[PDB]
Design a protein around this motif. Structure first.
Motif, PDB file in Angstrom:
ATOM      1  N   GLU A   1       7.640  -0.665   1.355  1.00 24.62           N
ATOM      2  CA  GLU A   1       6.860  -1.874   1.111  1.00 24.62           C
ATOM      3  C   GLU A   1       6.633  -2.646   2.403  1.00 24.62           C
ATOM      4  O   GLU A   1       5.536  -3.161   2.643  1.00 24.62           O
ATOM      5  CB  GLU A   1       7.557  -2.734   0.049  1.00 24.62           C
TER       6      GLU A   1
ATOM      7  N   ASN B   1      -3.333  -8.798  -9.369  1.00 24.45           N
ATOM      8  CA  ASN B   1      -2.034  -8.240  -9.725  1.00 24.45           C
ATOM      9  C   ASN B   1      -1.713  -6.976  -8.939  1.00 24.45           C
ATOM     10  O   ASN B   1      -0.535  -6.680  -8.714  1.00 24.45           O
ATOM     11  CB  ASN B   1      -1.980  -7.951 -11.226  1.00 24.45           C
ATOM     12  N   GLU B   2      -2.729  -6.227  -8.520  1.00 24.75           N
ATOM     13  CA  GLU B   2      -2.499  -5.019  -7.741  1.00 24.75           C
ATOM     14  C   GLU B   2      -1.952  -5.376  -6.366  1.00 24.75           C
ATOM     15  O   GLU B   2      -2.475  -6.263  -5.685  1.00 24.75           O
ATOM     16  CB  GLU B   2      -3.799  -4.223  -7.607  1.00 24.75           C
ATOM     17  N   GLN B   3      -0.890  -4.685  -5.957  1.00 23.99           N
ATOM     18  CA  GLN B   3      -0.248  -4.941  -4.672  1.00 23.99           C
ATOM     19  C   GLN B   3      -0.890  -4.049  -3.613  1.00 23.99           C
ATOM     20  O   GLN B   3      -1.068  -2.845  -3.822  1.00 23.99           O
ATOM     21  CB  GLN B   3       1.264  -4.723  -4.767  1.00 23.99           C
ATOM     22  N   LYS B   4      -1.262  -4.651  -2.492  1.00 25.67           N
ATOM     23  CA  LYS B   4      -1.938  -3.972  -1.398  1.00 25.67           C
ATOM     24  C   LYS B   4      -1.642  -4.726  -0.112  1.00 25.67           C
ATOM     25  O   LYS B   4      -1.244  -5.895  -0.151  1.00 25.67           O
ATOM     26  CB  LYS B   4      -3.454  -3.895  -1.630  1.00 25.67           C
TER      27      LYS B   4
ATOM     28  N   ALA C   1      -6.997  -4.909  -1.793  1.00 23.62           N
ATOM     29  CA  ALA C   1      -6.717  -5.009  -3.217  1.00 23.62           C
ATOM     30  C   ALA C   1      -7.992  -5.308  -3.996  1.00 23.62           C
ATOM     31  O   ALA C   1      -8.842  -6.084  -3.552  1.00 23.62           O
ATOM     32  CB  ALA C   1      -5.676  -6.095  -3.480  1.00 23.62           C
TER      33      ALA C   1
ATOM     34  N   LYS D   1      -4.561  -8.917   0.488  1.00 22.92           N
ATOM     35  CA  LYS D   1      -4.681  -9.564  -0.810  1.00 22.92           C
ATOM     36  C   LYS D   1      -6.142  -9.662  -1.233  1.00 22.92           C
ATOM     37  O   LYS D   1      -7.044  -9.824  -0.407  1.00 22.92           O
ATOM     38  CB  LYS D   1      -4.051 -10.957  -0.772  1.00 22.92           C
TER      39      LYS D   1
ATOM     40  N   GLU E   1      11.418  -0.329  -0.861  1.00 21.59           N
ATOM     41  CA  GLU E   1      11.489  -1.579  -0.114  1.00 21.59           C
ATOM     42  C   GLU E   1      11.326  -1.363   1.387  1.00 21.59           C
ATOM     43  O   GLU E   1      10.653  -2.155   2.057  1.00 21.59           O
ATOM     44  CB  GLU E   1      12.798  -2.299  -0.443  1.00 21.59           C
TER      45      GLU E   1
ATOM     46  N   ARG F   1       4.097  -0.600   4.277  1.00 22.55           N
ATOM     47  CA  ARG F   1       2.752  -0.706   3.721  1.00 22.55           C
ATOM     48  C   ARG F   1       2.026  -1.931   4.260  1.00 22.55           C
ATOM     49  O   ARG F   1       0.830  -1.867   4.570  1.00 22.55           O
ATOM     50  CB  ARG F   1       2.815  -0.741   2.193  1.00 22.55           C
ATOM     51  N   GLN F   2       2.734  -3.057   4.392  1.00 21.21           N
ATOM     52  CA  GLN F   2       2.119  -4.263   4.937  1.00 21.21           C
ATOM     53  C   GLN F   2       1.704  -4.096   6.392  1.00 21.21           C
ATOM     54  O   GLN F   2       0.925  -4.910   6.900  1.00 21.21           O
ATOM     55  CB  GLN F   2       3.071  -5.454   4.806  1.00 21.21           C
TER      56      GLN F   2
END
Ligand SMILES: NC(=O)c1cccc([C@@H]2O[C@H](COP(=O)(O)OP(=O)(O)OC[C@H]3O[C@@H](n4cnc5c(N)ncnc54)[C@H](O)[C@@H]3O)[C@@H](O)[C@H]2O)c1
Lengths: 249, 257, 249, 257
Positions: free
Chosen positions: C20, C186-189, C182, C192, C17, C23-24
């Motif tokens: 995460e 559904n894949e998180q990146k 992405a 989007k 988390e 990553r953004q």
RNA sequence: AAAA
RNA sequence: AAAA
């Protein structure tokens, strides 16, 4: 990218089902020797899956298979991925001799292992499959059968690691898709027989052509275009489907 | 994109050789008696396939104008052309200045003059052959989708190869264009070395020019077990081998151009 | 700007988390070695995140990873950012040996740490993320999805530290945006899939061109112009959106 | 910004070479039956695209004024020009003094005189070619937005490169100008070294001249996987590499000018 | 041309 | 032409 499985029948239950997930990932899988079968093909031979477990550690005649696999691994021909059915904490290292314990400890620290448990199966399978794709080129996710616009179809998802591949990568690739196409509906294979096959994911034009070409007279080929994001039909082997239709996703 | 040739035997010499250039451009060409199981001829053979049928090549010439029984073929071709099924491209062997319009009757001259002004023609001469062939071939590709240049056999890195050059007009094509395309490449592959075809038998075939991935896959797929397929990648500009049908060539080699 | 996370599974909950959020921020993040993976790319390799905690300090076989990370840190190849899950006051230094305590105390005083707590999460995440951007060039705030004039869009906010960058900075930049796009919904990146992407913040023209170019055939590109303060559409990959429309903010 | 050329073959020699200079200026040029499927006849091809269609180039000359089959071409071009759809630029191969107006009828002379006085013409001569080409090209850019100078291939720091020079007329453009722009650069990129195009194939392309950030991004983006992109920064005045498609060139190098 |  |  071939795979050789070394395991005991006490772990037989988890092995095929682990392999079955790996088979859907367009991975060559071989179970039933494994020592002299290493010398076959290109330098990128396979990744040894050491299904390490307490009952696996208790068989000496299973141990010598790990020696020759690891002994020639230093030559760079094959790399081993040890799979821990039980966690490292409760591995019965005491029963192992001094030479056996020293050998196992060296390969578990310097060489990287993957932990597996029955409970968190989905995460365990993903960690096992991805470790196969860690040191490899463009990946291959398991085939998923999805119905778009009322048409049954299977998606071959592949992801390129980084943003580029060598221009001569196709020369040393050991994946030909003719061996993964089912010939009968009852026969189990990564690609279902007569079911239309779709390619998904960004990639170069030659990679798309290389994967599409062996599907002639085998399955209907669908290609995904990201300009507008619908699948494009390029082959007509099934009745009622013409080359050029679009599937609104 | 099929082509029907209407001509006289006085112009027979220029017709096949014009057609031979057009055949290398991946164009279906029909003159006398071929593979359709219909009624032959060129009139009722218009009604075949999709609305994009063909482009009528009116090999207009002074001796062509002097045959009435050749004239009525131009009527039915033009009469149904107003329906939008087929479009005509009139080819002038001689220039418009010395066309013998006087021998034509009032109805014939009025009909010809209407179609030469409203409808577009192409001038052809034996002397400037290269330019004349280019103008004739391109007029076929004017109202058409992604073009197809004549196949050229080039030797790169000591390997014999033929290039299938295609250019997209504009920068995009309809997403469903492949549905209405009337070009399937299986009919243009030679089965014997002596047989003449746009694609040489057993000679590796390469695709050149920018385009979408599905267009590349659509053209590459029918070449399985027929010819070795090469694909051009513009990222580094060498040809990529994707099929291994000839000995000594593996899928993945590069040809430094 | 890559990031390697060293932590214990007792702190596993906070780690992803935390990652995460990182990553953004268009930051390369790598968790599952980390020692020999330091030698990869350019001298600006990564910033070691030492997830220091009481349970982390109690594992010797976790300690040696901090040694080789710090031992080669003196060479200037990598810099470490120690993250304190618990405050410095109650860190269990007594259980550590004399060598361990002397080593830890030296790196906590001379080298700068960041305090983290679950309670004040928003401030803790900002302090952690910014410390990554302290010694770095033009920053990258987390991607925010905002709807302007009824159009869904994500903003890539970047701020230049100071008022200028080296004219050859793009040569040594280790951020290519193709790896953060992405391929599947559904894949998180960080970016989007198929969602239009907008660039916000002042900067040179080449920096805007460098970030916009890899988005061809991937996402619709929007550019913010400060002359009148509306976003400008430059790419048309989604239906109904033409290059040149304005979004009144 | 498209261009339709109306001329006679007596002036054919000057027409392409005039067009060739105009093509390098990132201008769409269509002499006779060009790619555009639209019937070559520039008349009905006027109705295509946006209200900013094209500028009619009337290659006025003494032999052109005898071309009756051409006098009509102008009428319909000028008749619909009053609707504001297209504007005409008459190009005088010969000066106004020796234009053979006497052979023209009363209606023809009255029509020509009206359009030469109220509507602005450009004088052209073979002798002062460089100035004549500049006057012709600039008249295309008079009533247009941000200009586009001809592409120049320059070698900076031992690296071959071509510069796309564009100048903004005034100091600003409408914020929605990109919506109505009819210039997409994908059609001006060469696919083969032998093919002639405004942008050379595989040659790195550079953008020069002040402008907004979105304009730079709009022009740079279509060059992915086509050519290496260079961007000029006026803060220190060297070109900046943003794309790496050619070997040995990394994104971020500077070219000392 | 460092949000023109 | 690296999902045009
Ligand atoms: N491309 C051709 O070979 C061609 C031949 C004849 C005609 C055309 C097309 O006719 C369209 C205009 O309608 P209409 O033909 O009624 O009249 P008009 O414009 O006076 O016809 C051309 C006159 O000049 C000669 N000429 C031949 N080649 C060309 C050429 N590339 N550009 C200019 N002139 C050409 C031709 O023999 C005739 O004397 C217009 O779209 C034009 O391109 C193209």
């Amino acid at each position: 990218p071939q795979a050789f499985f070394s395991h005991n029948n006490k772990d037989k239950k988890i092995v095929l089902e682990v392999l079955e997930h790996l088979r859907q990932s367009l991975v060559a899988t071989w179970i039933d020797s494994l020592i002299q079968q290493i010398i076959a093909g290109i330098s990128k031979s396979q990744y040894f899956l050491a299904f390490l477990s307490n009952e696996y550690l208790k068989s000496d005649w299973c141990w010598d298979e790990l020696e020759q696999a690891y002994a020639l691994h230093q030559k760079g021909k094959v790399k081993i991925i040890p799979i821990l059915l039980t966690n490292r904490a409760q591995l019965d290292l005491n029963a192992l001799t001094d030479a056996r314990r020293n050998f196992l400890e060296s390969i578990l620290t310097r060489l990287k292992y993957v932990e597996f448990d029955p409970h968190n199966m989905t995460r365990s399978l993903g960690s096992v499959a991805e470790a196969l794709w860690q040191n490899e080129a463009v990946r291959f996710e398991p085939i998923r059968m999805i119905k778009v616009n009322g048409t049954e179809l299977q998606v071959v998802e592949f992801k390129i690691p980084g943003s580029n591949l060598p221009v001569d990568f196709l020369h040393h690739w050991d994946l030909k898709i003719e061996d993964f196409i089912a010939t009968s509906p009852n026969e189990q294979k990564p690609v279902k027989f007569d079911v239309p096959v779709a390619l998904y994911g960004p990639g170069p034009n030659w990679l798309y052509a290389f994967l599409t070409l062996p599907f002639k007279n085998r399955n209907t080929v669908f290609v995904f275009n990201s300009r507008t994001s619908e699948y494009i039909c390029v082959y007509s082997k099934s009745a009622g489907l013409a080359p050029g239709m679009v599937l609104k996703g």
